[PDB]
Amino acid sequence: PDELKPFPTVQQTIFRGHEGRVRSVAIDPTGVALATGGDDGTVRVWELLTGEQVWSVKLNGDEAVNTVRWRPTKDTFILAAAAGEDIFLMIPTHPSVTPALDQASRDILNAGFPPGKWARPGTRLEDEGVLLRITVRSTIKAISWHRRGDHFATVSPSGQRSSVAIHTLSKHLTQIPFRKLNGLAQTASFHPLRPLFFVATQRSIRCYDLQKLELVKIVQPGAKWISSFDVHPGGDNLVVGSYDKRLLWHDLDLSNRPYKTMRFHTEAIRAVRFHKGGLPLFADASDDGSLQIFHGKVPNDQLENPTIVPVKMLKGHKVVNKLGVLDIDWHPREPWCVSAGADGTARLWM
Amino acid sequence: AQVKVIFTTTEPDLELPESKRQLLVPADIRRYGLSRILNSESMLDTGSIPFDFLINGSFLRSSLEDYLTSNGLSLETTLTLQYVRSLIPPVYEASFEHDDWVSAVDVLSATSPAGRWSSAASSAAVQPGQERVLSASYDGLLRIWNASGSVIATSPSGSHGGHTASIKAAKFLTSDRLASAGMDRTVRVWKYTESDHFTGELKPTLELYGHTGSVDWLDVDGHSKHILTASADGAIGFWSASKASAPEPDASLLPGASTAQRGPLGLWSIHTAPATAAIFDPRDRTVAYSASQDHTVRTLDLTTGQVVSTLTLTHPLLSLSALTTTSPLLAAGTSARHITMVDPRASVMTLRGHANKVVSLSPSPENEYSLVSGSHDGTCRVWDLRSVRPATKEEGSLGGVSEPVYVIERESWASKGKKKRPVAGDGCKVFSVVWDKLGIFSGGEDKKVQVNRG
Ligand SMILES: [Cl-]
Ligand SMILES: [Cl-]
Ligand SMILES: [Cl-]
Ligand SMILES: [Cl-]
Ligand SMILES: [Cl-]
C-alpha cells in the first residue's frame, strides 16, 4: 500500500484466440495496441483495452513465434517477430496506420534495397503486410531494439556462430560483432542512454561497448541458468531472473554481486521486465501462473541504496501443460501490464 | 413510541408546504409507513408513490427506532428525512442478437434528444408508437432495430459505401440523420428513410476525414447539426453533419497513395494520451468537455480554437457525461474502476463498486441525481448522487463515496446457475449504455443489446 502506489491489482482484460501457448507480448510504443506471438505461428495485433483482435498473420506454416517487439519509434508502427530461424518485419493493419504513416514505415523498411540474408518474403506476406524476412543461421530466441530503432539484435542460443547478431535496418546489414562469447547466450539488451550493449548468457550478464567493440563490465548473478533480465531506464541498475525461483537486483554502481535476492516463486522465473517510462515498478513471470509485482526505485542520487518492496502477486493465469506465464511487457505511461501465459491467453492487469 | 421526523426533499414536483414539521410516532415504522404518510390524502395526495428516505445522506433500510438505537441517538431527536422517488427497478425484458460485439447503442424516442431535436424543424417528430434503437457492431455495420427487437434497417458493407472496419461509436442526431465513427478513421453521416412495410435504408450522406487513429467517442447536436469526436490520436474533432457547410478533406488521409467527402472544422489535439470522451455542454453548445487517458478533463471553447480550462485527476479517464444551477456536473468513468464526479469550475464525490473499467455513462431521463454507468466487468450500475457516505478509511481520501442503488447483469451469464461473474469481463464486457424512458439498453462483448426496464 502506502507510497508504493499505484500498481496492478486485478486483471481487467483477457486476450483470447491463440491455440497453444502464447510466447510473447509487446505493447505498441504509443500504448494503444498489443502484439502477441503464438505457438500456432501467428503474430497478432489487438486493441489494448477491449481485447478485440484487429490484425493477424501466420508467418510460417509450422513453427512457434518466440518473440515480438515493436520498433520503439512513434513515427513508424513497425513490428518485428521471430519464427524459428527467420525474423520478419511487418506493418500491421491498425487504425493508427494512415496512408502517410503506412508510406513512412514502408519507406523505412524498403530503404536499404551470410550471417544473415535480407530477403523480401512471399507474395502472400505483403498481401497481409509483411515487408521483410531476415534469415540467420540458427533459431532465434530473443529480439531487442536499440532505442532509436535503427539497430536491432537477435540472439540465437544454439548456434555459436550467429549467437549474438546486430542488425542495421538502414543498410540491410547483419553483423556478428564481439564474436565469441565464452557461453550460451540467452538474450541481449541495448542500453537506454549511452551506446552500450548487454549480452546475458546462462553464466552472467556482460556489458559491452559497440564501436569501441570492447568488453566493459561483467556481472555475475550467481545462479543456475539465467532465464532473462531487463535494464532499468536509468541504466545504472538491472534485474535478472533465473530458473532458481530467485530474482536478483544488480546495482552496477557498486558490485558485480547481486544487490538483492528475492524468492517469491514456486517454479522458474521465465520473464523479467522493468517499467520503462519512469514508474518505480518491475515484475517477474513464473511457471506458476503468478506474476510478482515489485516496487523498486532507482534513487534520485547516484550510488544510493535502491529501495525494493514487493507490492502485489497477480494470480489467474492457468498452469497449462507444465508451464506458467511466459512473458511480460509494461504500458508506456500507465501502471498497467500485460502477460503472456501458456493458457493460450494474454492478460491485461491494472 | 415517540420519535420526531421532519420531511425535506430535492424532488422538483413533489414538495410539502408547512406539513414538513410534524411528528411520526409509532417509532417502529419501516420506510413503508413513511411512504404511506407522504402519499396520504393529507400530505402529497399522490397516494401510491414509493418513497425512499435518506437520513444524513444514507438510505433507511430498517425501522426508525432500530436505526436510532443501533447508531446512538435514542436521544429524542428529530430525524431529518430527505424523501426521494424510489427507483423503479429496471428488470430484464428483451435481447437483440448480433453476429459480433456491440460497440454502441442509441435510442430514438419522442422524448429522446434526437426526438426533441426532430420536432423543431427534417422532422419526423417520432410518434409514441414506433421507437427505433441504433446498434453499432464490430461487424462494421449499423443496425436500426425495432422497439420489439427486429431489424428494420442494415447499413451497407465496406463496398457500397459503408464502413471499412469496426464501428466504435454511433448516435441519432435526428430521425432523418444519424452519425457513426470507427477504426477506419472516418466519421460517417447517414440518411435514414423507412418504408410503409417495416424495412429501412441507411444511405451515407457524408464521409468525414480528420482523424489519424481510431475514432473512439462521438457526441451530437441535432439543433446546430454539429458532431464532435474523441480519438486515440489524443485529438478532439468538431464537424458539421450538414454536407452544406464543410471544409474540403485533407486528402492525405483518404484511401489513396459516389459519396461526398469533407473535412473537420476545428480539429485540435489537446491531449498527451488517447482521448477517450468528448461531449457538448447541455446549456451552451459552443462549450465542450474532453476526457483522456492523460488523466485530464478539459473545458473547451469551440468558438475560439482551444482549451479554457484543465482539470487533472488521479487515474486515466475512459468516459464522460454531464448532469444538469446554471451548469453541469461531470461523471468521469475511470480505468481505476470508479467514477469521479467532477466540478469543472474554479472532485465532489466518487462512485465505487464497478469491478473493471467504466466505459459508458448516461443520465436518468427522470431525475438529475440518478445515473447509470456501464463497464467492462459485465454489469451496468445505477447510482443516486443523493446517496453519499463520508469516505471509508482505506483508499477513501476525501469523503465522496457513493455505492450503486441497482445492479444490472448480462442475461447471457445470469440465466446460468453460475455463481460469481467471470474473471475480468470475459464474454460479458459492456461497451455501451444509454438510458431512455423505454430505458437502459446495453451493448457489449456478448453480442447483445440488452433491454432493462420496469
Ligand atoms: Cl483478423
Ligand atoms: Cl510463405
Ligand atoms: Cl481461462
Ligand atoms: Cl461533392
Ligand atoms: Cl459485485
Coordinates of N, CA, C and O in Angstrom, one line a residue, chain A residues 41-171:
Chain A
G41 N 2.1 -20.1 -34.5 CA 2.9 -19.5 -35.6 C 2.2 -18.2 -36.1 O 2.6 -17.7 -37.1
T42 N 1.2 -17.7 -35.3 CA 0.6 -16.5 -35.7 C 1.1 -15.3 -34.9 O 1.3 -15.4 -33.7
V43 N 1.3 -14.2 -35.6 CA 1.5 -12.9 -34.9 C 0.2 -12.2 -35.0 O -0.5 -12.3 -36.0
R44 N -0.2 -11.6 -33.9 CA -1.5 -10.9 -33.9 C -1.4 -9.5 -33.2 O -0.6 -9.3 -32.2
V45 N -2.2 -8.6 -33.6 CA -2.3 -7.2 -33.0 C -3.7 -7.0 -32.5 O -4.7 -7.1 -33.3
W46 N -3.8 -6.6 -31.3 CA -5.1 -6.5 -30.6 C -5.3 -5.1 -30.0 O -4.3 -4.5 -29.6
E47 N -6.6 -4.7 -29.9 CA -6.9 -3.4 -29.2 C -6.7 -3.6 -27.7 O -7.3 -4.5 -27.1
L48 N -5.9 -2.8 -27.1 CA -5.4 -3.0 -25.8 C -6.5 -3.1 -24.7 O -6.6 -4.1 -24.0
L49 N -7.4 -2.1 -24.6 CA -8.4 -2.1 -23.6 C -9.5 -3.1 -23.8 O -9.9 -3.8 -22.9
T50 N -10.0 -3.2 -25.0 CA -11.1 -4.1 -25.3 C -10.8 -5.6 -25.4 O -11.5 -6.4 -24.9
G51 N -9.6 -5.9 -26.1 CA -9.2 -7.2 -26.3 C -9.8 -7.8 -27.6 O -10.0 -9.0 -27.7
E52 N -10.2 -6.9 -28.5 CA -10.6 -7.2 -29.8 C -9.4 -7.4 -30.7 O -8.5 -6.6 -30.6
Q53 N -9.4 -8.4 -31.6 CA -8.2 -8.7 -32.4 C -8.4 -8.0 -33.8 O -9.3 -8.4 -34.6
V54 N -7.6 -6.9 -34.0 CA -7.8 -6.2 -35.2 C -6.9 -6.7 -36.4 O -7.1 -6.3 -37.5
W55 N -5.8 -7.5 -36.0 CA -5.0 -8.0 -37.1 C -4.3 -9.3 -36.8 O -4.0 -9.6 -35.6
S56 N -4.1 -10.1 -37.8 CA -3.4 -11.4 -37.6 C -2.7 -11.9 -38.9 O -3.2 -11.6 -40.0
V57 N -1.6 -12.6 -38.7 CA -0.9 -13.2 -39.8 C -0.2 -14.4 -39.4 O 0.2 -14.5 -38.2
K58 N -0.1 -15.4 -40.3 CA 0.7 -16.6 -40.0 C 1.9 -16.7 -40.8 O 1.9 -16.9 -42.0
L59 N 3.1 -16.4 -40.2 CA 4.4 -16.3 -40.8 C 4.9 -17.6 -41.5 O 5.2 -17.6 -42.7
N60 N 5.0 -18.6 -40.6 CA 5.4 -19.9 -41.1 C 4.4 -20.9 -40.8 O 3.7 -20.9 -39.8
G61 N 4.2 -21.8 -41.8 CA 3.2 -22.9 -41.7 C 3.3 -23.6 -40.4 O 2.3 -23.7 -39.6
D62 N 4.5 -24.2 -40.1 CA 4.7 -24.8 -38.8 C 5.9 -24.3 -38.1 O 7.1 -24.5 -38.6
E63 N 5.7 -23.6 -37.0 CA 6.8 -23.0 -36.2 C 6.1 -22.2 -35.1 O 4.9 -21.8 -35.2
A64 N 6.8 -21.9 -34.0 CA 6.3 -21.0 -33.0 C 6.9 -19.6 -33.2 O 8.1 -19.5 -33.6
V65 N 6.2 -18.6 -32.9 CA 6.7 -17.2 -32.9 C 7.2 -16.9 -31.5 O 6.4 -16.7 -30.6
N66 N 8.5 -16.9 -31.3 CA 9.1 -16.8 -29.9 C 9.1 -15.4 -29.3 O 8.8 -15.2 -28.2
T67 N 9.3 -14.4 -30.2 CA 9.5 -13.0 -29.7 C 8.8 -12.1 -30.7 O 9.1 -12.2 -31.9
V68 N 8.0 -11.1 -30.2 CA 7.6 -10.0 -31.0 C 8.0 -8.7 -30.3 O 7.9 -8.6 -29.1
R69 N 8.5 -7.8 -31.0 CA 9.0 -6.5 -30.5 C 8.7 -5.3 -31.4 O 9.1 -5.4 -32.6
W70 N 8.1 -4.3 -30.9 CA 7.8 -3.1 -31.7 C 9.1 -2.3 -31.9 O 10.0 -2.2 -31.1
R71 N 9.1 -1.7 -33.1 CA 10.1 -0.7 -33.3 C 9.8 0.5 -32.5 O 8.8 1.2 -32.7
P72 N 10.7 0.8 -31.5 CA 10.4 1.8 -30.4 C 10.5 3.3 -30.9 O 11.2 4.1 -30.4
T73 N 9.7 3.5 -32.0 CA 9.6 4.9 -32.5 C 8.1 5.1 -32.9 O 7.5 4.3 -33.6
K74 N 7.6 6.3 -32.5 CA 6.1 6.5 -32.7 C 5.8 7.0 -34.1 O 4.6 7.1 -34.4
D75 N 6.8 7.2 -34.9 CA 6.6 7.7 -36.2 C 6.5 6.6 -37.3 O 6.5 6.9 -38.5
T76 N 6.6 5.4 -36.9 CA 6.7 4.3 -37.8 C 5.6 3.2 -37.7 O 4.9 3.0 -38.7
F77 N 5.4 2.6 -36.6 CA 4.5 1.5 -36.4 C 5.0 0.3 -37.2 O 4.4 -0.1 -38.2
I78 N 6.1 -0.3 -36.8 CA 6.7 -1.5 -37.4 C 6.9 -2.6 -36.4 O 7.4 -2.3 -35.3
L79 N 6.4 -3.8 -36.7 CA 6.5 -4.9 -35.8 C 7.6 -5.9 -36.3 O 7.7 -6.2 -37.5
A80 N 8.4 -6.4 -35.3 CA 9.3 -7.5 -35.6 C 8.9 -8.7 -34.9 O 8.5 -8.7 -33.7
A81 N 8.9 -9.9 -35.6 CA 8.6 -11.2 -35.0 C 9.6 -12.2 -35.3 O 10.2 -12.1 -36.4
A82 N 9.8 -13.2 -34.4 CA 10.8 -14.2 -34.7 C 10.2 -15.6 -34.8 O 9.7 -16.1 -33.8
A83 N 10.3 -16.2 -36.0 CA 9.8 -17.5 -36.2 C 10.9 -18.4 -36.6 O 11.4 -18.3 -37.7
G84 N 11.3 -19.3 -35.7 CA 12.4 -20.2 -36.0 C 13.7 -19.4 -36.3 O 14.2 -18.7 -35.4
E85 N 14.2 -19.7 -37.5 CA 15.4 -19.0 -38.0 C 15.2 -17.6 -38.6 O 16.1 -16.9 -38.8
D86 N 13.9 -17.3 -38.9 CA 13.6 -16.1 -39.6 C 13.0 -15.0 -38.7 O 12.1 -15.2 -37.9
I87 N 13.5 -13.8 -38.9 CA 12.9 -12.6 -38.2 C 12.2 -11.7 -39.3 O 12.8 -11.2 -40.2
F88 N 10.9 -11.6 -39.1 CA 10.1 -10.8 -40.0 C 9.8 -9.4 -39.6 O 9.5 -9.2 -38.4
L89 N 9.9 -8.5 -40.5 CA 9.5 -7.1 -40.3 C 8.2 -6.8 -41.0 O 8.1 -7.1 -42.2
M90 N 7.2 -6.3 -40.3 CA 5.9 -6.1 -40.9 C 5.2 -4.8 -40.4 O 5.7 -4.2 -39.5
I91 N 4.1 -4.5 -41.1 CA 3.3 -3.3 -40.8 C 1.9 -3.7 -40.6 O 1.1 -3.8 -41.6
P92 N 1.4 -4.0 -39.4 CA 0.1 -4.5 -39.1 C -1.0 -3.5 -39.6 O -0.7 -2.3 -39.6
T93 N -2.2 -4.0 -40.0 CA -3.3 -3.1 -40.3 C -3.9 -2.7 -38.9 O -4.4 -3.5 -38.2
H94 N -3.9 -1.4 -38.7 CA -4.4 -0.8 -37.4 C -5.0 0.6 -37.8 O -4.7 1.2 -38.8
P95 N -5.9 1.0 -36.9 CA -6.5 2.4 -37.1 C -5.4 3.4 -37.1 O -5.5 4.5 -37.8
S96 N -4.3 3.2 -36.3 CA -3.2 4.1 -36.2 C -2.5 4.3 -37.6 O -1.9 5.4 -37.8
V97 N -2.7 3.3 -38.5 CA -2.0 3.4 -39.8 C -2.8 4.1 -40.8 O -3.8 3.6 -41.3
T98 N -2.3 5.3 -41.2 CA -2.9 6.1 -42.2 C -2.1 5.9 -43.5 O -1.2 5.1 -43.5
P99 N -2.5 6.5 -44.6 CA -1.6 6.3 -45.7 C -0.2 6.9 -45.6 O 0.7 6.4 -46.1
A100 N -0.2 8.0 -44.8 CA 1.1 8.7 -44.6 C 2.0 7.8 -43.7 O 3.2 7.7 -44.0
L101 N 1.5 7.3 -42.6 CA 2.2 6.5 -41.7 C 2.6 5.2 -42.3 O 3.7 4.7 -42.1
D102 N 1.7 4.6 -43.1 CA 2.0 3.4 -43.9 C 3.2 3.7 -44.8 O 4.1 2.9 -44.8
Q103 N 3.1 4.7 -45.6 CA 4.1 5.0 -46.6 C 5.4 5.4 -45.9 O 6.5 5.1 -46.4
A104 N 5.4 5.9 -44.7 CA 6.6 6.2 -43.9 C 7.3 4.9 -43.4 O 8.5 4.8 -43.6
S105 N 6.5 4.0 -42.9 CA 7.0 2.7 -42.5 C 7.6 1.9 -43.6 O 8.7 1.3 -43.5
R106 N 6.8 1.9 -44.7 CA 7.3 1.3 -45.9 C 8.6 1.9 -46.4 O 9.5 1.2 -46.9
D107 N 8.7 3.2 -46.3 CA 9.9 3.9 -46.7 C 11.1 3.5 -45.8 O 12.2 3.4 -46.3
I108 N 10.8 3.2 -44.5 CA 11.9 2.8 -43.6 C 12.4 1.4 -43.9 O 13.6 1.1 -44.0
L109 N 11.4 0.5 -44.0 CA 11.8 -0.9 -44.3 C 12.4 -1.2 -45.6 O 13.3 -1.9 -45.8
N110 N 11.8 -0.5 -46.7 CA 12.3 -0.7 -48.0 C 13.6 0.0 -48.3 O 14.3 -0.3 -49.3
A111 N 13.9 1.0 -47.5 CA 15.2 1.7 -47.5 C 16.3 0.6 -47.2 O 16.1 -0.2 -46.3
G112 N 17.3 0.6 -48.0 CA 18.4 -0.4 -47.9 C 18.3 -1.5 -49.0 O 19.2 -2.3 -49.1
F113 N 17.3 -1.4 -49.9 CA 17.2 -2.2 -51.0 C 18.2 -1.7 -52.1 O 19.4 -1.9 -52.1
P114 N 26.3 -16.3 -45.3 CA 25.9 -14.9 -44.7 C 25.4 -15.0 -43.3 O 24.5 -15.8 -43.0
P115 N 25.9 -14.2 -42.4 CA 25.5 -14.1 -41.0 C 24.0 -13.8 -41.0 O 23.3 -14.3 -40.1
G116 N 23.5 -13.1 -42.0 CA 22.1 -13.0 -42.2 C 21.8 -12.7 -43.7 O 22.7 -12.1 -44.4
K117 N 20.7 -13.1 -44.2 CA 20.3 -12.7 -45.5 C 18.9 -12.0 -45.5 O 17.9 -12.5 -45.0
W118 N 18.9 -10.7 -46.0 CA 17.7 -9.9 -46.1 C 17.0 -10.2 -47.4 O 17.6 -9.9 -48.4
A119 N 15.8 -10.7 -47.3 CA 15.0 -11.0 -48.4 C 13.6 -10.6 -48.3 O 13.0 -10.5 -47.2
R120 N 13.0 -10.2 -49.4 CA 11.5 -9.9 -49.5 C 10.9 -11.3 -49.4 O 11.2 -12.3 -50.0
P121 N 9.8 -11.4 -48.5 CA 9.2 -12.7 -48.3 C 8.1 -13.0 -49.3 O 7.9 -12.2 -50.3
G122 N 7.4 -14.1 -49.2 CA 6.4 -14.5 -50.2 C 5.4 -13.4 -50.4 O 5.1 -12.6 -49.6
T123 N 4.8 -13.5 -51.6 CA 3.8 -12.5 -52.0 C 2.6 -12.4 -51.0 O 2.2 -11.4 -50.6
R124 N 2.2 -13.6 -50.5 CA 1.2 -13.7 -49.5 C 1.4 -12.9 -48.3 O 0.5 -12.5 -47.5
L125 N 2.7 -12.6 -48.0 CA 3.0 -11.9 -46.7 C 2.9 -10.4 -46.9 O 2.4 -9.8 -45.9
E126 N 3.2 -9.8 -48.0 CA 2.9 -8.4 -48.2 C 1.5 -8.2 -48.5 O 0.9 -7.1 -48.4
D127 N 0.9 -9.2 -49.1 CA -0.6 -9.2 -49.3 C -1.2 -9.0 -47.9 O -2.2 -8.3 -47.7
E128 N -0.6 -9.6 -46.9 CA -1.0 -9.3 -45.5 C -0.1 -8.3 -44.7 O -0.3 -8.1 -43.6
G129 N 0.9 -7.8 -45.4 CA 1.6 -6.6 -44.9 C 3.0 -6.8 -44.3 O 3.5 -6.0 -43.7
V130 N 3.6 -8.0 -44.5 CA 4.9 -8.3 -44.0 C 6.0 -8.0 -45.1 O 6.1 -8.7 -46.0
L131 N 6.7 -6.9 -44.8 CA 7.7 -6.4 -45.8 C 9.0 -7.1 -45.9 O 9.7 -7.1 -46.9
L132 N 9.5 -7.7 -44.8 CA 10.8 -8.3 -44.8 C 11.0 -9.6 -44.0 O 10.3 -9.9 -43.0
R133 N 11.9 -10.4 -44.6 CA 12.2 -11.7 -44.0 C 13.8 -11.7 -43.9 O 14.5 -11.7 -44.9
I134 N 14.3 -11.7 -42.7 CA 15.7 -11.8 -42.4 C 16.1 -13.1 -41.8 O 15.7 -13.5 -40.8
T135 N 17.0 -13.9 -42.6 CA 17.3 -15.2 -42.1 C 18.7 -15.3 -41.5 O 19.7 -14.9 -42.1
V136 N 18.8 -15.8 -40.2 CA 20.1 -16.0 -39.6 C 20.4 -17.5 -39.6 O 19.5 -18.3 -40.1
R137 N 21.5 -18.0 -39.1 CA 21.9 -19.4 -39.3 C 21.2 -20.4 -38.3 O 20.9 -21.5 -38.7
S138 N 21.0 -20.0 -37.1 CA 20.2 -20.9 -36.2 C 19.2 -20.2 -35.3 O 19.2 -19.0 -35.2
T139 N 18.2 -21.0 -34.8 CA 16.9 -20.4 -34.3 C 17.0 -19.2 -33.4 O 17.8 -19.2 -32.4
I140 N 16.2 -18.2 -33.6 CA 16.1 -17.0 -32.8 C 15.3 -17.2 -31.6 O 14.1 -17.5 -31.6
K141 N 15.9 -16.9 -30.4 CA 15.2 -16.8 -29.2 C 14.8 -15.4 -28.9 O 13.6 -15.1 -28.8
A142 N 15.8 -14.5 -28.9 CA 15.5 -13.1 -28.4 C 15.6 -12.0 -29.5 O 16.4 -12.1 -30.4
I143 N 14.8 -11.0 -29.4 CA 14.9 -9.8 -30.2 C 14.9 -8.5 -29.3 O 14.1 -8.4 -28.4
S144 N 15.9 -7.6 -29.5 CA 15.9 -6.4 -28.8 C 16.2 -5.2 -29.8 O 17.2 -5.3 -30.5
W145 N 15.4 -4.1 -29.7 CA 15.7 -2.9 -30.5 C 16.5 -1.9 -29.7 O 16.4 -1.8 -28.5
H146 N 17.4 -1.3 -30.5 CA 18.1 -0.1 -29.9 C 17.1 1.1 -29.9 O 16.2 1.1 -30.7
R147 N 17.3 2.0 -28.9 CA 16.3 2.9 -28.6 C 15.8 3.8 -29.7 O 14.6 4.3 -29.7
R148 N 16.7 4.1 -30.7 CA 16.2 5.0 -31.8 C 15.8 4.1 -33.0 O 15.4 4.6 -34.1
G149 N 15.8 2.8 -32.8 CA 15.2 1.9 -33.8 C 15.9 1.6 -35.1 O 15.3 0.9 -35.9
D150 N 17.1 2.1 -35.3 CA 17.8 1.7 -36.5 C 18.6 0.4 -36.3 O 18.7 -0.4 -37.3
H151 N 19.0 0.0 -35.1 CA 19.7 -1.3 -34.9 C 18.7 -2.2 -34.2 O 17.9 -1.7 -33.4
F152 N 18.8 -3.5 -34.5 CA 18.2 -4.5 -33.6 C 19.0 -5.8 -33.5 O 19.5 -6.2 -34.5
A153 N 19.1 -6.3 -32.3 CA 19.9 -7.5 -32.1 C 19.0 -8.8 -32.0 O 18.0 -8.7 -31.3
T154 N 19.4 -9.9 -32.6 CA 18.8 -11.2 -32.4 C 19.7 -12.1 -31.7 O 20.9 -12.2 -32.1
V155 N 19.3 -12.8 -30.7 CA 20.0 -13.8 -30.0 C 19.5 -15.2 -30.3 O 18.3 -15.5 -30.1
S156 N 20.4 -16.0 -30.9 CA 20.2 -17.4 -31.2 C 21.1 -18.3 -30.3 O 22.2 -18.5 -30.6
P157 N 20.5 -19.0 -29.3 CA 21.3 -19.7 -28.3 C 22.1 -20.9 -28.8 O 23.3 -20.9 -28.5
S158 N 21.6 -21.7 -29.7 CA 22.2 -23.0 -30.0 C 23.5 -22.8 -30.9 O 24.6 -23.2 -30.5
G159 N 23.3 -22.1 -32.0 CA 24.4 -21.9 -32.9 C 25.3 -20.9 -32.3 O 24.9 -19.8 -31.9
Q160 N 26.6 -21.2 -32.1 CA 27.5 -20.3 -31.6 C 27.7 -19.2 -32.6 O 27.9 -18.0 -32.3
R161 N 27.8 -19.6 -33.9 CA 28.1 -18.7 -35.0 C 27.2 -17.4 -34.9 O 27.8 -16.3 -34.8
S162 N 25.9 -17.5 -35.0 CA 25.0 -16.4 -35.1 C 24.5 -15.9 -33.7 O 23.6 -15.1 -33.7
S163 N 25.1 -16.5 -32.6 CA 24.6 -16.3 -31.3 C 24.1 -14.9 -31.0 O 22.9 -14.7 -30.9
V164 N 25.0 -13.9 -31.0 CA 24.6 -12.5 -30.9 C 24.8 -11.8 -32.2 O 25.9 -11.7 -32.7
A165 N 23.7 -11.4 -32.8 CA 23.7 -10.7 -34.1 C 23.2 -9.3 -34.0 O 22.0 -9.1 -33.6
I166 N 23.9 -8.3 -34.4 CA 23.4 -6.9 -34.5 C 23.1 -6.6 -35.9 O 24.0 -6.6 -36.8
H167 N 21.9 -6.2 -36.2 CA 21.3 -5.8 -37.5 C 21.2 -4.3 -37.6 O 20.8 -3.6 -36.7
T168 N 21.5 -3.8 -38.8 CA 21.3 -2.4 -39.2 C 20.2 -2.4 -40.2 O 20.4 -2.9 -41.3
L169 N 19.1 -1.7 -39.9 CA 17.9 -1.6 -40.7 C 18.1 -0.7 -41.9 O 17.4 -0.8 -42.9
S170 N 19.1 0.2 -41.8 CA 19.3 1.2 -42.8 C 20.0 0.6 -44.0 O 19.6 0.7 -45.2
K171 N 21.1 -0.1 -43.7 CA 21.9 -0.7 -44.8 C 21.6 -2.2 -45.1 O 22.3 -2.8 -45.9

